[PDB]
Every structure is written in structure tokens, then in C-alpha cells.
């Protein structure tokens, strides 16, 4: 896939694409609840993913937010402070977003691609938190408010390493 990367002042990369997801990935469907972002991030980090593995991710995001809030430019367009931000995202079944990917990527030192679905299993843009190539990073699929994991087609391990 040919990228046109733009490094943003917000602190991550952006690129338009025109991609049939299944030509490159397998969609690993995550539970259709408000924890789906954390499920899909756990799918990229834990090979033996469990139904509660997303909790491991969500707890790390809260500490990542406390560590990196004052140096993360993406926070500046939220309209919240740290105390109010944590009070929202720590709610059970509350929707995760790209800012939580931002914090987790900083804490775990892993690159995450977020592919935005515009029509059925087709993506029109992608954002990257990190520098690593696509095949050695976590890829997830943004589907309205839902998130799924994307696993490279010719791979045997679901999680990265
Ligand atoms: Mg257990």
C-alpha cells in the first residue's frame, strides 16, 4: 500500500489511502461493546488474548495519560483537563478513541496504525502513532465508533513482537 504521510503538529502521522482491507489484513472481530478499542489493542499485544485482557490495556492508558498529558499535543483539542479526562474514559464500557491509542503507544513504545473505514471493508485514510513499518506494528480498524483488530494476511502470530 502506497502512503502519503503527513507528520502533524498534533503529534502523529496522517495519510490518505484507497485500500481493500482484506487484500492486506484479516479482520479479527472484537466484541461489540464500548471496550472494543482496548480489546483490539490487547489483540495486538497478547497472543493468548482473554475476554478481560482489555482491562490490562485500559489500566495502562490511565497511567500513560498521567505521565504524558502535559507533553501530548493531541490533548489540546479535547476541551478537558487530566482529572476530567480520566473521569470519563475510566467509565465502564466507555468508548475509546485515538487519544487513548496515542497514550498507549507512548507507554508501550509500540507503533499503532488506525485505519478508518468509510465503506464496507474499505479505508480512505490512516493515522500512525509511531514510526515502525506496518507489518511490525499494531493495526486496528476504525468502524464508526467500533474498533476491530487487523492481522496481516500472511502471518501466523496474531499479536506483534
Ligand atoms: Mg484469567
Numbering used by the authors: 5 to 165
What does the report in the manuscript say about this coordinate set?
One specific mechanism used by nairoviruses is the production of a deubiquitinating enzyme, termed the vOTU, that disrupts the innate immune response. Interestingly, the nairoviral L segment also encodes a viral homologue of the ovarian tumor protease (OTU) at the N-terminus. Instead, the vOTU’s primary function appears to be the reversal of post-translational modifications by ubiquitin (Ub) and the Ub-like protein interferon stimulated gene product 15 (ISG15). Each vOTU possesses a seven-stranded beta sheet as the core feature, with five major alpha helices framing the rest of the structure.
The vOTUs from DGKV, QYBV, and TAGV readily crystallized and were solved to 1.62 Å, 1.65 Å, and 2.05 Å, respectively. TAGV vOTU, on the other hand, prefers K63 and K11 to a greater extent, while not possessing as much activity towards K48. In TAGV vOTU, Trp73 fits between Leu86 and Thr79. Similarly, for TAGV vOTU Thr76 and Glu78 form electrostatic interactions with Gln110 and Tyr133, respectively. In TAGV vOTU, this pocket is largely hydrophobic possessing two tyrosines as well as a valine. Looking at X-ray crystal structures of the CCHFV and DUGV vOTUs bound to Ub reveals that Leu8 in particular has to be spatially accommodated in a pocket deep within the interaction interface. To confirm that this interaction with Leu8 is likewise involved in Ub binding with these other vOTUs, isothermal titration calorimetry (ITC) was performed using the TAGV vOTU to determine the relative binding efficiency of alanine and asparagine Ub mutants (Ub-L8A and Ub-L8N) compared to WT Ub. While WT Ub bound strongly with a dissociation constant (KD) of 11.5 ± 2.5 μM, Ub-L8A showed no detectable binding under similar conditions. As expected, the disruptive mutants I130R in QYBV and Y129R and V131R in TAGV completely knocked out the ability to process Ub-AMC, in keeping with a previous report demonstrating that the presence of arginine hindered ERVEV vOTU Ub activity. Making the reverse mutation in TAGV vOTU, H146R, essentially knocked out this activity suggesting this residue to have a key impact in diminishing FARV vOTU’s activity compared to other vOTUs.
